[PDB]
Amino acid sequence: QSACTLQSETHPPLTWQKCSSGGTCTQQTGSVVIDANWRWTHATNSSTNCYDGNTWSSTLCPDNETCAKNCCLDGAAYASTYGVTTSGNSLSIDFVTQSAQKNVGARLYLMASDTTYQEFTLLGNEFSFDVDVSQLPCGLNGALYFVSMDADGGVSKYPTNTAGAKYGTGYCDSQCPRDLKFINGQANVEGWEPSSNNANTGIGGHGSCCSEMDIWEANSISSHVAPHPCTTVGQEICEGDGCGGTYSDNRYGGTCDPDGCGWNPYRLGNTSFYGPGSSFTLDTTKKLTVVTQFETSGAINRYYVQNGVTFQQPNAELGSYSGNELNDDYCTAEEAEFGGSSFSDKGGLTQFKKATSGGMVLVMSLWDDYYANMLWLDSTYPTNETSSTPGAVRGSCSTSSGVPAQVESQSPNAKVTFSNIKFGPIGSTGNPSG
Ligand SMILES: *[C@@H]1O[C@H](CO)[C@@H](O)[C@H](O)[C@H]1NC(C)=O
Ligand SMILES: [Co+2]
Ligand SMILES: [Co+2]
């Protein structure tokens, strides 16, 4: 797809800290851009929509190639249309924003320049950030994660995509998402099937796969961290159900691991560590600091800071595993106790280390779940299981919670705020910001 300018594109600025082993940190200046799927897609020479509701223009988009040639992505009014704002080192995303039409959440990427994404090499380093999840009820997910996307959004590999990172193109993750309207410089109209429960989305014949590090997926009730390996480290297109993931019949028939080696303290037994109020170790009604360290062994460590008090990820005992470090033993013990073989089939942490050794793009989003109502994160899942089933209970939310239309109607003012991002060698982000 090309880019149109009927609406200007001004990326909200966002600063972050780059720290060094020497003990100092220096301020960096970037910005955020919203993913192409949230944008208006119209004819290059008119205001005629190429996509509207959840169906494509049969005339402008008779096939994927013709569609990309006739269509363009336009600019975004970040605050008024998408409820996205920034102030210094802070980023806020509102859940439902009402303008000429209704918008739900957003998916944003941190940029290095107005035309390129910022790439981070996680291995050997740590990522720290502050988050306020107090306004996120059951069914919502304020997420901060990394994916192995190209810095240019795919332009160099696919010339038919001239919009690029400036317009949020090139997304990919461990779900091999098929809901993307444009993949590899081509539209995804071929094989497109409108969503039965979402008037604005659908699933196409193509998907976009790549490694994914979910540093943070949470709301005021539950939180989870999870590395997701793929047999192909970087962005790669997939065909239909061969894609695997939540958008296909068989989520395990692809090149990526859709489940990941997830670590949810509540799911592991510590139901007093994270929640609203003083009865929990971490009070989710207040801002908290989350630090994630990627040691060269490939294992992942985590600690939190709130009100000046530091807490390592809580210890967990699963099978023969005991500790608080997310390593091979934990992931293997998890599949043995909770079930599944997706993470290990895709190479586990060894394969994932190939992703963190390379560059990954920072993603920050706010979303509700039209496929599973976010039950996998904050409730009992599958809903027919009980606490007698190992790992079934992940949070205290009702198995009836998270219906998109309901949470959108009841909690439109929900929001998430990410701030004070700091990146650098392990042991360096706690030092004074520059
Ligand atoms: C939960 O984790 C916190 C922090 O490590 C710890 O202080 C507390 O004793 C743990 N409680 C349970 C039930 O595991
Ligand atoms: Co194809
Ligand atoms: Co270690």
Alpha-carbon Rg of the chain, whole angstroms?
21
Residue 56 C-alpha to ligand 2 middle, in angstroms? 17
If one counts every other C-beta atom within 10 angstroms of the C-beta of residue 5, the result is 9
Angle at 302 between CA 13 and CA 144, to 5 degrees: 30
Residue 78 C-alpha to ligand 2 middle, in angstroms? 33
159: left (phi over 0), alpha (psi -120 to 50) or beta: alpha
Q: Are 224 and 263 in contact (CB under 8 A)?
A: yes
Please state the φ and ψ torsions of residue 172, each to the nearest 5 degrees: -165, 155
Residue type (1 letter), 128? S
The CA dihedral of 327, 330, 334, 335, to the nearest 10 degrees, is 60
Pairwise CA distance, residues 12 & 330, whole Å: 39
Judge residue 46's burial from the number of C-beta atoms within 10 Å of its C-beta, 0-12 exposed, 13-18 middle, 19 or more buried.
Answer: exposed
The alpha carbon dihedral of 318, 324, 328, 329 has a sign of negative
The three state secondary structure string of the chain is CEECCCCCCCCCEEEEEEECCCCCEEEEEEEEEECHHHCCEEECCCCCECEECCEECCCCCCCHHHHHHHEEECCCCCCCCCCEEEECCEEEEECEEECCCEEECEEEEEEEECCEECEECCCCEEEEEEEECCCCCCCEEEEEEEECCCCCCCCCCCCCCCCCHHHCCCCCECCCCCCCCEECCEECCCCCEECCCCCCCEECCEEEECCEEEEEEECCCCEEEEEECECCCCCEEEEHHHHCCCCCCCCCCCCECCCCCCECCCCCCCCCCEECCCCCCEECCCCEEEEEEECCCCCEEEEEEECCEEEECCCEEECCEEECCECHHHHHHHHHHHCCCHHHHCCHHHHHHHHHCCCEEEEEEEEECCCCCCHHHHCECCCCCCCCCCCCECCCCCCCCCCHHHHHHHCCCCEEEEEEEEEEECCCCCCCCC
Pairwise CA distance, residues 204 & 181, whole Å: 8
Closest residue by Cα to residue 370 from 203, 205, 237:
203
Closest ligand to residue 310's CA: 1
Ligand 1 atom closest to Cα of residue 314: 5
Domain with 61 in it: what CATH number?
Answer: 2.70.100.10
Closest residue by Cα to residue 66 from 95, 36, 43:
43
Please state the φ and ψ torsions of residue 170, each to the nearest 5 degrees: 85, 10
Q: Whose CA is nearest to atom 5 of ligand 1?
A: 314
Tell me, in Å, the resolution of the deposited structure. 1.6
Residue 336 C-alpha to ligand 3 middle, in angstroms? 22
Judge residue 32's burial from the number of C-beta atoms within 10 Å of its C-beta, 0-12 exposed, 13-18 middle, 19 or more buried.
Answer: buried
Ligand 1 atom closest to Cα of residue 269: 14
Closest ligand to residue 63's CA: 2
Active site residues: 212, 217
Residue 296 C-alpha to ligand 1 middle, in angstroms? 27
Q: Are 141 and 126 in contact (CB under 8 A)?
A: no
Establish whether the linkage from the previous residue to 382 is cis, with ω within 30° of 0: yes
**What does the longest C-alpha to C-alpha distance in the chain come to?**
63
Host domain of residue 98: 2-434
Into how many domains does the chain fold?
A: 1
How do beta strands 282-283 and 274-275 pair?
parallel
CB within 8 Å of 166: residues ≥ 6 apart: 3, 9, 11, 33, 114, 115, 153
Q: What residues line ligand 1, using a CB cutoff of 6 Å?
A: 270, 272-273, 281, 311, 314
Please state the φ and ψ torsions of residue 260, each to the nearest 5 degrees: 75, 170
